[model samples]
Target: PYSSPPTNLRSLRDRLTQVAERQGVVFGRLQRHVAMIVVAQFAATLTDDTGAPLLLVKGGSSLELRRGIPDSRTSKDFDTVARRDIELIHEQLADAGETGWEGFTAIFTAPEEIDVPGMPVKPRRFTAKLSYRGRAFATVPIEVSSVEAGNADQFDTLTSDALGLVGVPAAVAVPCMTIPWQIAQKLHAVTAVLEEPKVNDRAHDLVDLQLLEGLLLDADLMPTRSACIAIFEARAQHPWPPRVATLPHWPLIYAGALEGLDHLELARTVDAAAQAVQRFVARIDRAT
Candidate 1:
C-alpha cells in the first residue's frame, strides 16, 4: 500500500539534503552540519520567535556559505554575532522548544553544560544536537558574541538565502561583515593563534584568510587603500577583549586545507596582508 507521511516536515529534510548535495558535500554529518545552519536561521527568523537577528556569520563555515566553495573545508560549528541580546536569544530558543528535521531532532542546551573550551568568559554560547531517532547525529555548536566583544553594528545583508532552505514568507536575510573587516578579523585570528607555542596551524583562519584574500582580489572587493589602512589601524591599536585570550589553539585539522600551497604562496599572502597594515605607516610618514 505505498504510503508516506504527509507533512512539511519531510520537505525540510529533503530540502536540506538537496542543498548539501548540490553544494557537492557527500558526507552525511557534514551535510547535516551545513543544513542546520540554514534551518536554525529560519527558526530564529520565525515571526513567533523573539530572538534577535544573527547579525554576522563568522568563521570558515561562513566563508563557505559566502563563496559557494563546495566541500572544500568542513567547519565544526556555526559562529555568529548577535545584533540584540544574546541571552534573550538563548532564552527564546529554550522556550520555543525543539526544532526538528525529517528523521532528526534538535535540542538547544546551555553553555555551561556544553563546556566549550576557549573564550575567556562564557559569551552567550549554546550547543544543539541533531539526533537521529533518539541517537546523536551531529552537534551544532552555536556561538553568539556580543557587541561589547568588539563586533560591529554595521554589516551587509545577503542578497540570496540558503538556496533551497528558506522559502517564501521568510523575510529573514543573512548578514555578513565587510571584506575589510573580515580581513582585519582574520589577521587578528592568525596573529592570536600562531603566537601560542603548541599551535601549528590556524586552520580556519589560515585557509579562510587565503581564500578570502584571493576572492576579494578577484572580485575587486578588496578594500581601498584608505579603508584597508583604517581596518589595520583598528587591529593594531584597538584594545582586544579578554575573551579573545581564551580561544584554544586551532591547528590545521582538515586535510588538504593547506595543500598545493607552500611557504612562498603563504609569504605572498602574508606580505600582502602585512602591506595592508604597513600602508598606514607609509601614509603617516608622508603626512608628517
Candidate 2:
C-alpha cells in the first residue's frame, strides 16, 4: 500500500517520491509543456489518455532533490538556502551505502534491476494522492518508464523541444541569472505565504509591500511587466470571492484612468513608484 504526505509542497513532493521509488516507479514534477502535448495527443486519439511521448516525464527519479551544498559550482545551483539541504540529503544517502544520485533509485530496486515496468510496452503508472494536514495537495498518475538515468537526458531534450506551450515567458523560465533582488524577495514572500500561513503578519506585510514595489520597479522588463501590473491594480476592487464587500474605492479610481495614463506627462514626471500610487488614490480623493 502507498501512502502520501500532507499538503505542504516540500514534504508532499519529498514523501510521495519515496513511495514511488519503493514501489519501483519513476516520479517528478509534471512538466507543463509535456502535459499539454499529452492532452493534445489524447484529443487526437479521441481518448483522454494521451500517455507517454506526450507526457514527456523527466527527472523521473529525482524531481524534488534538495538543493546542494553552497560552492558546489553546478550550473544548476539550487537556490542558496536549498543548497545546504541538498548536500545533507546527499550525505545521508551516502552513509546508507547508496551512491550520490542513486538513492532516489534504490528506494525501489536493488542494483541492476532499476528499470522495472508495470505496463505492456506502455509502462505501468499509478495514481498518487498527495496530501498535507488531511487536505489533498495534488493527485496524478506517475508514468512508469523502463529507461534508466543514463538515458534520462533524452527525455529532457525532448521536453525542451516542446516548451512553447508552457505559458510562461523566457524572462521567467531561464535559470542561472541575476534575479533582480526585488523579484527574488517577492518570490521568497510568495513561497512564505503558501508554505507558512503562520508566518508573522508584519513579515508578511513587509514582503507583500516589497513585492508590490518590485512590480512597479520592473517598469523596465520585457512584455511590459509594468503595464501588466497596471492592469492588475485596476482590478483590485474585484479581488475574488473571499471578500464580498466593496474594496476601497481608491483602487477603482486608478482603474478608470488607466487608459489615459500613458499620455499624461505626470506619469513620466514624478517618481514612478510614488506617482503611480498617488495618481491611483487621488482620483478617489483618498490620496493620503
Candidate 3:
C-alpha cells in the first residue's frame, strides 16, 4: 500500500512543476526552479513599513519573466534589490524555513561580492537553494543590489508568480521590474559591457531588443527613454539613444551570443538587431 505521505509529496511535486510550466518557466531539475520560487516566497514575506516592496527583481530574469516570449532563452538568475537589512531578510527566511514553507527546505547563505570585468557596479550574490526530505533539489544564484536601485514606479505586482508554488493559503505575488525598465537597463548594460574589448557576453541585449519590436508603443518608449538616460548616466556614463559606433565590434561580437540563442544567419540577425534599435529610437524620439 502506498503511504499517503509519499503520495502527497508526489502530488505536490506535480502541482509545482505544472504551475511553473504554465508560466513558460522551468520548475525542476538542475536546481533551476529555485530562483523564481525564492522570489515568490521571499517577496511575499517582506514589505517596507510604508508597504513598499522590499524585494524587487531586475536584469535578465525580469526580462524573461515579464516578457514570456516563446522559443526565447530562459534566464534562471535573479538580479534582486533589497530595500532593508540583509540580516533581517535572513531572519525572516529562517522563520519560514523551519516550518518548511510548503515543502521548501530553504538554504539562503551569506552574500559575497563578485567582480565583473567592465561593469561599473558589482552585486553581492547569494546562492539560494531549496531541498525536500533532507536532499537538495534546486538552487538559483541571485545577485542583489541594496536600497532602491530601481524607481518605485518600476515595480509591478505579478500574480503570474513565474515559479511553481503549491499549498499556499492564497496566491503569492512577486514584485518585479516592468518592461520599460528592463529595456533601459539592458541598453545601459550593453553599452557598458560593449565598451570593453570582449562583448560576446552581452550580445543577448541586442538579440533581446530584436525580439521586442511591435510590442513597444510610444507610452512604453517614453518611460524607456527616461530610464535609458538615467541608467546610462549612472552606469555607463554614455549618452542615451545608443549608437552603433560606440560598440566597436558590432555584428561579429554578437556571433556567438546569437548562436547560443537562435539559429538565424549572422548578417540577418545583426541587421534585425540594428533595425530594432532604429525603430526603438524613432519611437522614443516621437514621445513627448
Candidate 4:
C-alpha cells in the first residue's frame, strides 16, 4: 500500500505497466529498473562529501514523479541542476575512486564536459554507467546547470516512495523546482528549440508542454506574461540559446514543426498550450 501524495497510485501503476509493455519489458521490471537507477543517483547526491548541495533533479523524470502523464515515456538521461560549486563536486567524484563513487557502483565514468549551447563554461555535465551484480544497469547523465539558471535556491523535496509508488523502504529524497518555475523553464526550453531548430529534435519539449498545460490548468499555477518574459530573458541571458540580437521577441511562437507526438493530437495540445500562454499574458493586462 504505497502512495505518492497528490498522485493516484492505481493510475501510475497502470501507466507504468504500459511503459514496460511498449518498451518490451516483461512486466513490472521497467519501473523497478528505472527506479533503482534514479534512487541510486539520489543516494549519491544525498551522501556526497562536499557538504554542499550539488544538484537537484529536474526535467521529464521529475515531471513523471509529479504526475505520471504521457505513460511509459521513458527518459534517456538523468537531468539535474548544479550549484556554483560544480568543480568541487567533480573533484569529489574523482576522490571517491573507481570501484564506487559516493556509494554507487560506477562501471564507467567520464570527466565533466561542457554541453550548454553557447556560454560553454560554468555549468558542465558528468556521465557514467552504474553496475548491479557485475552488469551495467543504467547510464546516468548528470546535466548540471549553474545556480544562475533560475531560482535554484528554492526547491521542494519528495520522498523516494513518491517515485517508487511501492512502499519501498529506505526511500531517498529528491529535490526539484516548484511547478510554476518548472513550467516557465519548460516554456523556455520549447522556445529555445523553436528559436534554434537544429539544436535537437525537441519533440520531447512539445510533449512536455502539452502535459504541462494540464498541470497548469489543474493546479491554477499559470504564470503572468511579465513573469514569462522575465524567464525567457533570464534564460536567453544565461545562454540557453536565442542569444542572438535579432532573436524574436517575447510570446515566442511555435510553428507546427514538432516531434514525438501524433500530428492531430499534437495539434490539439499545442493549441491548448498556446491558449494557456495567451491567458497567462492576459493576466498581466487584467492586472494593469
Highest lDDT scorer: 3
**Each prediction's whole-model lDDT (CA):** 0.49, 0.26, 0.57, 0.50
lDDT of 4 by residue, 32-91 (tens): 445434434543454336564566667766765565423324555556666555666555
Give, for candidate 4, the lowest lDDT window spanning 10 residues. 242-251
Candidate 4: TM-score? 0.62
RMSD of each predicted structure: 7.4, 20.8, 5.1, 8.0
The TM-scores of all predictions, comma-separated, are 0.59, 0.18, 0.73, 0.62
2 or 4, which is superior by TM-score?
4
lDDT of 1 by residue, 36-80 (tens): 554455334533245435556766556656655442255666766
Residue pairs of candidate 2 with colliding backbone atoms: 5-131, 6-131, 6-132, 7-131, 7-132, 67-86, 68-83, 119-124
Candidate 2 local distance difference test against the native: 0.26
Instruction: List clashing residue pairs in candidate 1.
Output: 119-246
lDDT for 44 (candidate 2): 19
Top-scoring candidate (TM-score): 3
Q: Give per-residue lDDT, candidate 4, residue 19.
A: 51
